[PDB]
Amino acid sequence: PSQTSFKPLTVVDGVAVNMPNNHPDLSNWLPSIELCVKKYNEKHTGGLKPIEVIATGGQNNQLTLNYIHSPEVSGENITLRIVANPNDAIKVCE
Questions:
Q1: For residue 37, what are the CA distances in angstroms to 2, 3, 66, 73, 84?
Q2: What does DSSP say about strands 52-54 and 16-20: parallel, antiparallel, or unpaired?
């Protein structure tokens, strides 16, 4: 584990997904990633699953993820809900 300029966004199955501060909001990627990561978490349950997930890609159809396993001090603020679920045949992610 080491210091990094990344903040938490959402957790899926128990994996805190952080994003690069030097990037826009990932409201649309929220459901896209939360669903993608679910796959990896499915195969890897409990400790098996990754510690954190660095999700990137703001615009220009940018979609890049990173599996990081290193728990470190951190925290969030507050969240309510998003209520979204866009469909797509060609999912570059998965």
A1: 23, 23, 10, 22, 17
A2: parallel
Q: Is 4 helix (H, G, I), strand (E, B) or coil?
A: coil
Alpha carbon 44 to its chain centroid, in Å, reads: 16
Spatial neighbors of 83 by CB under 8 A, at least 6 apart, are: none
How were these coordinates obtained? Answer: NMR
- CA neighbours closer than 13 Å in the CB half-sphere of residue 35: 14
User: For residue 55, what are its two tokens?
Assistant: 């999700």
Asked if 16 and 8 count as a contact pair (C-beta separation under 8 A), the reply is yes
Q: Give break positions in the chain: residue before each, C–N beyond 2.5 Å.
A: none
- Residue 25: which residues within 8 A CB-CB, separation 6 or more? none
